[PDB]
Ligand binder design. Sequence first.
Ligand SMILES: Nc1ncnc2c1ncn2[C@@H]1O[C@H](COP(=O)(O)OP(=O)(O)O)[C@@H](O)[C@H]1O
Ligand SMILES: Nc1ncnc2c1ncn2[C@@H]1O[C@H](COP(=O)(O)OP(=O)(O)O)[C@@H](O)[C@H]1O
Ligand SMILES: [Mg+2]
Ligand SMILES: [Mg+2]
Lengths: 656, 557
Amino acid sequence: IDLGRVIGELIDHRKLIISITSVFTLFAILYALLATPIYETDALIQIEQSAPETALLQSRMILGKTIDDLNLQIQIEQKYFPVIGRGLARLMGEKPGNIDITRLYLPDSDDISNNTPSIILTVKDKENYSINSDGIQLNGVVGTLLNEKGISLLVNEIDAKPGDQFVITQLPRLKAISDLLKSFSVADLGKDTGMLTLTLTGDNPKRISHILDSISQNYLAQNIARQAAQDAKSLEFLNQQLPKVRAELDSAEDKLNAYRKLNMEAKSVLDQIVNVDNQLNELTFREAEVSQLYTKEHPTYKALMEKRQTLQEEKSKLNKRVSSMPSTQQEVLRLSRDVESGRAVYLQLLNRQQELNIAKSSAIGNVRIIDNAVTDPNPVRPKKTIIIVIGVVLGLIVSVVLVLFQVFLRRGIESPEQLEEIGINVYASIPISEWDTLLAVGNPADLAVEAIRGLRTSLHFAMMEAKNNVLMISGASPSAGMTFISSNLAATIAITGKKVLFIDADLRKGYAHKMFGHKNDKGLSEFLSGQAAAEMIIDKVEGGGFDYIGRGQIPPNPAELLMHPRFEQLLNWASQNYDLIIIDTPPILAVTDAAIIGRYAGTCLLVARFEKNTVKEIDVSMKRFEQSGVVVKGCILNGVVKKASSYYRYGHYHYG
Amino acid sequence: IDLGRVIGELIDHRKLIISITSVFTLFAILYALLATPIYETDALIQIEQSAPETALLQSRMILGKTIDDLNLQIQIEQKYFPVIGRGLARLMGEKPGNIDITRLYLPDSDDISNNTPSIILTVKDKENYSINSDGIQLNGVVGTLLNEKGISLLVNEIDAKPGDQFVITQLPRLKAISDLLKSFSVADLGKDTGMLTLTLTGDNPKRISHILDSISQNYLAQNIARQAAQDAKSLEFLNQQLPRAVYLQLLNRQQELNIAKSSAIGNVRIIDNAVTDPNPVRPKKTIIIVIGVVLGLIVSVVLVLFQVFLRRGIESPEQLEEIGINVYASIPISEWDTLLAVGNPADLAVEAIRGLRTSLHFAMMEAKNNVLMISGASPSAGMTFISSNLAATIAITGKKVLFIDADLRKGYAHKMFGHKNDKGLSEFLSGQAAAEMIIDKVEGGGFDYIGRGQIPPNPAELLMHPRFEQLLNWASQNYDLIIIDTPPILAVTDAAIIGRYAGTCLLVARFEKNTVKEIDVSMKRFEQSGVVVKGCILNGVVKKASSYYRYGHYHYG
Ligand SMILES: Nc1ncnc2c1ncn2[C@@H]1O[C@H](COP(=O)(O)OP(=O)(O)O)[C@@H](O)[C@H]1O
Ligand SMILES: Nc1ncnc2c1ncn2[C@@H]1O[C@H](COP(=O)(O)OP(=O)(O)O)[C@@H](O)[C@H]1O
Ligand SMILES: [Mg+2]
Ligand SMILES: [Mg+2]
């Protein structure tokens, strides 16, 4: 191949190329403009090693401590119904809403799969709101806590417009730890120094900085505990307190065994209290530790008793509910409470004993925060430019390969050279006429009619020394242009003052009578079957100037009629009253009518359609005519259009 | 391919090559002369390690301290409307202005995007100025501080000419830290030495040196505070432990801790305070210009090679003669509504046409009659030009010539000869005229002609009338030569109808427009209609250095 071919093919398929590339680039643009941006924050820590510190920072202990501090197990998502509502809302300048939640406890359905309970909160105003878990509508108010139907909720400072909806999920603690750990990274950045670089990525530019600050504070507090833990009495306090609790736990277990040897509400309110007790105990430890390493007027410490206030209020409401259930199940719950309270505290103290050991045996005495966490205002993802470039390049690659397949899979004719290589004379090339009437009469100045005049002058020289004045037009496949060519050629030969007869011998799908204006009675069939004479079948074209014979009524045995000798009698009679006779026939590959007629025709031409037919089809038609004893003079290419890749140039342009 | 061909192609396209390369080089010059210069300053620090000190130097605490000290959060820009105003103003040697601002507070609009409040200050004199936020015009004066509409401002020492405008931005502290960081670099250069090279690049040759000095001072004063502290912690502990030999022992230890606190010089030492290299490091003008010139050359050469491989027109008669087509002449462009063979009888094109005339005088013997038909493949190839001038030159030799304009669709011969447009060829063929009212005399010629007449609606069908052959037979007895001009053969079929009665037929191929394919198709289409084409005439030739086919198209006399 050569570059001229490929350039021509590209120019010809430019519309497809442009469409595909535009679609791919549009998809890339929309993706890069709708993807939620991802911000990144960092901090710098000074270590007085650093590999065990790297391992310890990403441990479940410290991250879990941070989550318990910041209530990261409460997931809040602004609701947009489509997969693109969020992006457009950001683009429209709409301010994303947020709600501050300080207490959430769902009834914890805890089925086989959905371990994460979730509810939907709809904003009604700046004060009240609606809540639905499974369609059950409840109304709540900012400020006052809600304790209904095994659902505990505390909403503060709703910042949104009315009508907004938010999904509230209570995801499990380990899930929150895993989510935090996925997006959190630690590095040394020097491979030897006491410098640690902490990095965190997330979609909220403020939340991630707060989280990273909390992580740094927790780690520093853990190491600063080391220096003060050796002389601390908490070690001896825990060493003595733990055996006492275990006996209480064991005694609680033993009592529970004696009473044993399932009310839904009673079980739920039991879970209500146990959750409250857990938060109260851990907060009590947290308040102690914060009071030691921080001050009371610190906002963190101010947060502590406020949450402690809420927990006591929730417990008070729970006990009032417990006061309302019958004592029969109350005894079971009180036994159930103590066992779980014992287990929870025993678990809590075991960590406390473990954590206190963690402080003491720490080789790195001094840990310093050089740079507190800040967030880079430029999002790190998505990287818009690379996405757009990849989209454009992908569009170009797929367009080019698609064009190469379409080029390599075409087999139709493209230029008369393909036919002339085989040894077939092409007598004309007719272009597509963009214009049920004769073209050679409606628009005599059309390009196609000019090409047909060229064909007329070719024939006037070819059809000399022919055995008679009968010309047959046929073709390989239907809808190639046989009737079009034949009728228009008849018109153009008629306008020069010669008597022309057009015979529509397509006894299967002929419609020439429609295109000429007709008296459909007494066509060719009626003559061939013997029930008409030769004079009632000939009609005059109105806008033409030549006579015609229509097919007539469709017979059931077309090919058998054409073999009757009356057909040759008709041709011999007509050949003395007309200067030219043009016969239209069905395709030769489909049926055999053309080969029957061709015995009586002095000249025979095939019509090959430009892009549809193949060289093989035309060769096969040539040979099939040969076998039946019909000599084909040549071919006529029809329906040509301008192709830049052709590099073969017709005169199909207006001159006048 | 060979070297001669490519050299010729470059010689021929030299105009395009020079134009493209010069444009690229001009843009390179403009960029290298208008880009804002960037200066670079450096300093050298000695470390008494060196891996964590790099990270501590680029920390937000030290850079933030520097920014707070030198107020890097007040950004001042001289205003030039275009992306080239600053560069041009520098080129005329105009001194940029500067303003000292020591206190600034904007209302902090802080919308979703524009977190950076800004104002525009227009200097009116050495003392007063106008301030606009969003059209809110205020007047301020150097010295007195301003607090109006939630804007606090203090300007000192305006150094500019009146009428200048300055954009004043109060960017957030973190943005200033990031901006400082991106232009600040630290390297070790020894991988073990206590040597650190600090580098800072910026547009102001003095401001960057001040900033780097401030950074070094902050880092150094921070470092000694670390060593002094651990001594100070030890000194504080000993003082707090004071309750007589032990009493003197602690006092002596206290003095040792006092002297160790004051003798601060420690791990960090400033070898070289920052200085600025006066030659800007960017833009690197020479490499920019070299890249521009090379890019121009490469794109020009690729464009020329592209055009060469996509060229398809005829270039020399050898291309036609390979196929087996006799080329009887080659006519060049005549750079000179009149017959060329009369206006400028000594033109080069008329010389080539005389060569064609002598070729014909030998080709047209043994022709069945004395009729010559000139046709072509595509329109505006030169058929009318060639036919008319050939008639003129053959007429000046004393032979009777008849010129027929059988282009019944767009023939304009009557215009070019001076006309009585009535009774053309159409009127004769349709039967509404006789053979004698149609023949007209050319004034500056010497031959008769027949114009087309009125454009008919059925040109090709008229030409089939036997009256046309009657006219030719009659005229062939009263003239020595008959020339017939015809429409192209690819467009319409008129030429192939006419060619039945012509003894000789020639094609005209236009030099670069037509290709060999059209000429071959035209020959074959003439053959199918029973018309034998004698040969071809190449028209419109111009000099190509790449040709290596070389004509007699030069003056001799
Ligand atoms: N060059 C052409 N320009 C415009 N229409 C054409 C051309 N060739 C064929 N056609 C139209 O396409 C249709 C199929 O051609 P037709 O000859 O009637 O069928 P068939 O070849 O099977 O006998 C017809 O409507 C015809 O008018
Ligand atoms: N070698 C030439 N030098 C100068 N002008 C030419 C030359 N060949 C053709 N032309 C001019 O360019 C125009 C196109 O030629 P023309 O013969 O009129 O078209 P056509 O061949 O279709 O009849 C004409 O105006 C002609 O005078
Ligand atoms: Mg048909
Ligand atoms: Mg002309």
